[PDB]
Amino acid sequence: NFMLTQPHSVSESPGKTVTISCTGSSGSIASNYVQWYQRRPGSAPTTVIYEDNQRPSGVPDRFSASIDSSSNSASLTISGLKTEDEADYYCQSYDSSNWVFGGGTKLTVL
Amino acid sequence: CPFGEVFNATRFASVYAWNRKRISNCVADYSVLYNSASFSTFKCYGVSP
Amino acid sequence: EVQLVESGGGVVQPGRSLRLSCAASGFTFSSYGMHWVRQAPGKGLEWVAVISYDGSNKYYADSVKGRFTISRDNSKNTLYLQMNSLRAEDTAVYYCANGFGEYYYYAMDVWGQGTTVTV
């Protein structure tokens, strides 16, 4: 059914331009509001961003949400990385009433 | 437009020698097309829906 | 201009009978449908059900079919959702909102504020 394509292995040195790529399908990428969900192990999950227009106090300004239709891709750059924030990124999308898990993304920072 | 007959058509003709019977001069219904949750995929290119 | 506030009771014992309303007005509610979305914690958004305007064909999810029955009236532009036999997994904020555009559901712009319900 649903096919997810991601690079097998990719890495870039810090201080350069990085762009995490996760293909979007089952609709128009300009009509989907991409909201990231995180669940840090060892901690109770809490919502950090919802309704796309509400800002709780302490929310960093580095995160920005928009859609770029010039090259049919979205650009996001995050600075101020913390040691406890090192984890794995998984991009999840839903179609109709089906859930599909990813194959598994492993990334090592050298 | 009598597109419902094609929608529930039992058989389809061959690609190379399909019978040509132009049907036009009407306004379609699209009443049942609004429930797209039963279709596995929905793709649109070149224009936003 | 666009103000929509949800109100209701507080501590409600499960199994009791009570009716709630989230009135939608200020526009053409005749061509606008009411959608209910449940957001499971940790997981993504969950589809609940959809209703056609004609009413000839109605489709419901396997996890909500049978137990629940919905009623709407285009004359008063109010949707009634009778909650019977509340479930533990249903203890979540209820979003009363109308779908994006006209006859579109795959796109979402504004989330639901939520209604005050206790299970």
Q: What is the three-class DSSP state of B7?
A: helix
The conformational region for residue A27 under phi > 0 = left, psi -120 to 50 = alpha, else beta, is left
Phi, psi (deg, nearest 5) at residue A98: -130, 140
Pairing of β C49-51 and β C70-73: unpaired
Q: Is the dihedral of CA A49, A53, A58, A60 positive or negative?
A: positive
H/E element, A7: none
Residue contacts between A and C (CB atoms, under 8 Å): 26
Q: What is the three-class DSSP state of C90?
A: helix
Contact residues on chain B for C105, CB-CB shorter than 8 A: 36-37
Q: Are C86 and C28 in contact (CB under 8 A)?
A: no
How do the domains of chain C map onto residue ranges? 3-119
Pairing of β C49-51 and β C78-81: unpaired
Structure-derived torsion over alpha carbons of residues A93, A95, A96, A101, reported in degrees to the nearest 10: -70
User: Tokens representing A71?
Assistant: 């090259």
Q: Which residues 65-94 of A are in CB contact (within 8 Å) with B? A: none
Burial label for C100, CB within 10 Å (0-12, 13-18, 19+), is middle
User: Tokens representing C67?
Assistant: 């137990």
Q: Name the resolution in angstroms.
A: 3.6
User: Tokens representing A24?
Assistant: 């979007």
Between chains, do B49 and C54 touch, taking CB under 8 Å as contact? no
Half-sphere exposure of A79 (CA within 13 A, CB side): 5
The residue among A62, A40, A59 whose CA lies nearest residue A50 is A59
In total, chain B counts a number of residues equal to 49
Q: Domain C3-119 is in which class?
A: mainly beta
Q: Is C2 on the interface with A (CB under 8 A)?
A: no
Q: How many CB atoms lie within 10 A of CB B7?
A: 9
User: Tokens representing C79?
Assistant: 């949707």
Q: Cα separation of A12 and C63, whole Å?
A: 45
In total, chain A counts a number of residues equal to 110
Per CATH, which fold does A3-109 belong to?
A: Immunoglobulin-like (2.60.40)
Q: What does the DSSP 8-state code read for residue B43?
A: -
User: Tokens representing B2?
Assistant: 């009598």
Q: How was this structure determined?
A: cryo-EM
Q: Cα separation of C55 and B48, whole Å?
A: 28
Identity of the residue in A26, A30, A97 whose CB atom sits nearest the CB atom of B42 = A26
Phi, psi (deg, nearest 5) at residue C78: -135, 135
Count of H helices and E strands in chain B? 1, 0
Structure-derived torsion over alpha carbons of residues C7, C13, C19, C20, reported in degrees to the nearest 10: 20
- Ordered DSSP codes for C30-79: TS--EEEEEE-SSS-EE--EEE-SS-SSEEE-TTTTTT--EEEETTTTEE
How do the domains of chain A map onto residue ranges? 3-109
Q: Cα separation of C100 and C28, whole Å?
A: 14
Pairing of β C49-51 and β C58-60: antiparallel
Q: Cα separation of A55 and C5, whole Å?
A: 19
Q: Nearest chain B Cα to C56, which residue?
A: B32
Q: Cα separation of C38 and C36, whole Å?
A: 7
